[PDB]
Amino acid sequence: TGITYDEDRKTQLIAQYESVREVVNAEAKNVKILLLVVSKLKPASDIQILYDHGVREFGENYVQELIEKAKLLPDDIKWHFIGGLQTNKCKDLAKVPNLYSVETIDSLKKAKKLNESRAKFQPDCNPILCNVQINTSHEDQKSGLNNEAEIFEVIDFFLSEECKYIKLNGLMTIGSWNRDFATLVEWKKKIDAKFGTSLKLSMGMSADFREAIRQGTAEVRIGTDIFG
């Protein structure tokens, strides 16, 4: 049956979502890109609209909010967890079967906890794709790595034979408030050179996604421009 929704809202949200997709695509041609639809704090009905339209990759920031939404909505959604990740919440997150991606690995202890919890609670699911989150701000932020030695230790773990239930996909930055995107591109260059990787970048939100695309992102993460 699905979550019931208003048709004027349906028409409006579909229109906004298509308008963004068209711009992502036109920027990408002048230079696919993943358009991650960020639905954090938006109602399950709004997700249902876009799901019915054909969208599958949705980004959420709060652990309990994601777990409940995942139960309410179809199981072939690919959820991305893109908010603050606490070591003591990896077990709850690793229980969601269709947890497709976590983009906020910012410590070795978190990577290790997530791998272990996933081995424990959903061994038979596809490994969670992970981005390592970097503080590109050159200031001091609550989240994101900045020390080269500690970033390399995290990548090293992900490439080890022990890291079986999560898989290194890329790097992620929320940036700052484009030199942030240039510094994540430089981190990709160093990491790729040292370890043999070819990391995907996740950078670009509603205010700055056009620049992100222009500087080589593989994924932009858009909330406000779509759900408006």
Ligand SMILES: *Cc1c(COP(=O)(O)O)cnc(C)c1O
């Ligand atoms: C909220 C959020 C987004 C979307 O931000 P908008 O300005 O609404 O497009 C993208 N990435 C992360 C990590 C976020 O928390």
